[PDB]
Symmetry: C3
Subunit: 106 residues, 3 copies
């Protein structure tokens, strides 16, 4: 898939967490988010489509997705312990990175 489909998947699952009721929906949505971030790691953002795949910008893109993946791991650890409200609070932080990375690499 392209980078934009993965962006849309992240946003949709973030809203799903925003509306979630129990811990299972949070776990499933954050797992889908992890998968979408791993997939987006293989994509080229539009702003970097004219750049070397070996450029430092591509490296920084991928390592930023690594940082996001580790924050997602933290949120998933919170959700696996049944912490619904804290998983949602942590996901509210994920949003400020997902939308930001969206606004820059657009």
């Amino acid at each position: 898939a392209d980078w934009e489909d993965n962006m849309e998947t992240l946003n949709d699952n973030l809203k799903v967490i925003e509306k979630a009721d129990n811990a299972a929906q949070v776990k499933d949505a954050l797992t889908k988010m992890r998968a979408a971030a791993l997939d987006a790691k293989k994509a080229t953002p539009p702003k970097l489509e004219d750049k070397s795949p070996a450029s430092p910008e591509m490296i920084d893109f991928r390592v930023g997705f690594d940082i996001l993946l580790w924050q997602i791991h933290d949120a998933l650890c919170l959700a696996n312990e049944g912490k619904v409200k804290e998983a949602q609070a942590a996901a509210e932080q994920l949003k400020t990175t997902v939308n930001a990375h969206w606004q820059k690499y657009r």
Copy 2:
């Protein structure tokens, strides 16, 4: 360095997990698999030994290994919590991913 030795290690530790009696053997084999996958991250498969290290193929290679690493993390989290049967079942999700990465990139 060598893709084949690490793929071996993966298969052998999968067998060890399947034939394991307690959670400790599962944990140890999963740690060995994690080490082998991290090592294979640096390798170049023969199907791509004629491609550039920044090519999309190499990127997909390394990111598929990251995906395998997160699957191994899930299995290890299961094993640490004492759910041996669910950990083995999750390791049965690892055999298919390992085999696909094998056939496609070997």
Copy 3:
């Protein structure tokens, strides 16, 4: 931060864990270490100043940092369970990896 600042962060937090008393300091220092390693993944060590970011040396550099990250996660899990002594023992292995990385890439 640069490469040197991140390595100094890693060292400082290593000692903090080493002389900590409760689990909270251990988890705080290990979280600092995780952030520092993720940031250093985007760095260019002095011995690789002019090599391409997609060079095999740089790929091995980033994968060594991935190994460090997974060890950091293991220590963080041991500390979150309350096993402070096991966490510090695991962080002793963290010191080995950090110092080897500094001795090879300085």
